[PDB]
From a paper:
The enzyme 2,[name] ([name]) catalyzes the interconversion of 3-phosphoglycerate and 2-phosphoglycerate, a key step in the glycolytic pathway. [name] converts 3-phosphoglycerate to 2-phosphoglycerate through a ping-pong mechanism in which a phosphoenzyme transfers a phosphate group from an active-site histidine to 3-phosphoglycerate to form a 2,3-bisphosphoglycerate intermediate that subsequently transfers the phosphate from the 3-position to yield the 2-phospho­glycerate product and a reconstituted phosphoenzyme. As a key enzyme in glycolysis and energy metabolism, [name] is a potential target for novel antibiotics.
Two vanadate structures with Burkholderia [name] were obtained, each with additional molecular entities covalently bound to the vanadate. One of the properties that makes vanadate such a powerful transition-state mimic is its ability to exchange its O atoms and derivatize with a variety of ligands. The crystal structure revealed that the glycerol O2 atom had become the apical ligand of vanadate opposite the N∊2 atom of His9. In this arrangement, glycerol adopts a conformation and position similar to the glycerate moiety of the natural [name] substrate. Difference electron density was weaker for the tetrahedral vanadate, but the presence of vanadium was confirmed by calculation of an anomalous difference map (data not shown). The three equatorial atoms of vanadate were approximately coplanar and formed polar contacts with the side chains of Arg8, Asn15, Arg60, Glu87 and His182 and the backbone N atom of Gly183. This arrangement of the equatorial O atoms is nearly identical in the glycerol-bound structure, indicating that the vanadate is providing an accurate structure of the transition-state structure of phosphate despite the presence of a nonsubstrate ligand such as glycerol.
Numbering used by the authors: 1 to 230
Write the structure that this text describes.
Amino acid sequence: MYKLVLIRHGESTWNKENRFTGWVDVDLTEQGNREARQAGQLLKEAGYTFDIAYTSVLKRAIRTLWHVQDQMDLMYVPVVHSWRLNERHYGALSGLNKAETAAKYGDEQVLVWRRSYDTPPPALEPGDERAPYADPRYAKVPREQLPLTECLKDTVARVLPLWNESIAPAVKAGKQVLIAAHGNSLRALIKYLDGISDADIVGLNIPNGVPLVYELDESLTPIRHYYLGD
Ligand code: VO4
């Protein structure tokens, strides 16, 4: 039997400002920092430890991991930072206030952009400042694989290779794994692990900075999962 622990980044500046974020590299608020620290103390107090961690290339997730590591005295463990764990790419909605967007385009249209499994938001223009092509984080990713927008289906397809190629072999080797990532990248993983349908997964909400523990059997099939804390 294996345990795998998941955590969404703490409150980001754009969570506070009610903006779609996607791949824009915004940082944690003081409240986000505190959530991250609290998650680390909770894992420490429950006697959890880790051998390795995976995270995105986005600093809200990485700094969340840093706080967890600091509180746990695990600053020395290997960390794999992967663009494959990045939040779902929100296209031309990245940076827009969610309430002002629904006001302009209507709740129905925004429902689609937030919840349609297979239909992405409107794309960035290739020359947008927010496009990923000149970013050193993605310099070794083939240009064709870099998104200008994503539906959750795209996000799942992008995350799973990291699981197959690295995380699953890590777990099977008896490494105690922590994944510090984002709402939709974690939903993508949870969808695969729990075999959740296209329709069901769209309604799963993961709170900021709460450890989510998965117990897996010999075939990496979930036995049970649960949040730690209150
Ligand atoms: O801006 V979202 O919390 O619907 O990924």
